[PDB]
Amino acid sequence: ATIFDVLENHLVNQNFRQADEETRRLLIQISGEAAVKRGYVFFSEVKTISPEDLQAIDNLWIKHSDGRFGYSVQRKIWLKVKKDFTRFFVKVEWMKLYRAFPDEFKWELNDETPLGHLPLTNALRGTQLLKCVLSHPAFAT
DSSP-derived letter for residue 50 is: -
Cα separation, 47 vs 113, in Å, equals: 30
| Residue of 61, 71, 78, 94 that binds a second copy (CB under 8 A) | 94
Q: How far is the CB of 123 from a second copy (least distance, A)?
A: 5
CB 73 within 8 A of CB 116: yes
Q: Is 80 in the site for a second copy (CB under 8 A)?
A: no
- Long-range pairs for 103-110 at CB < 8 Å and ≥24 separation? 107/16, 107/17, 107/20, 108/16, 109/14, 109/16, 109/65, 109/68, 109/69
CB-facing half-sphere around the CA of 113: CA atoms within 13 A: 17
| Residue of 100, 110, 140, 141 that binds a second copy (CB under 8 A) | 100
Query: In this complex, which beta carbon is closest to a second copy, that of residue 22 or of residue 58?
Result: 22
Q: How far is the CB of 127 from a second copy (least distance, A)?
A: 5
Nearest in space to 93 (alpha carbons), one of 45, 138, 81: 81
Q: Is 140 in the site for a second copy (CB under 8 A)?
A: no
Query: In this complex, which beta carbon is closest to a second copy, that of residue 55 or of residue 93?
Result: 93
Cα separation, 17 vs 62, in Å, equals: 15
| Residue of 47, 50, 86, 108 that binds a second copy (CB under 8 A) | 86
Q: How far is the CB of 94 from a second copy (least distance, A)?
A: 6
Footprint of a second copy on this chain (CB under 8 A)?
Answer: 17-18, 21-22, 24-25, 38-40, 43, 85-86, 89, 94-95, 98-105, 120, 122-128, 131
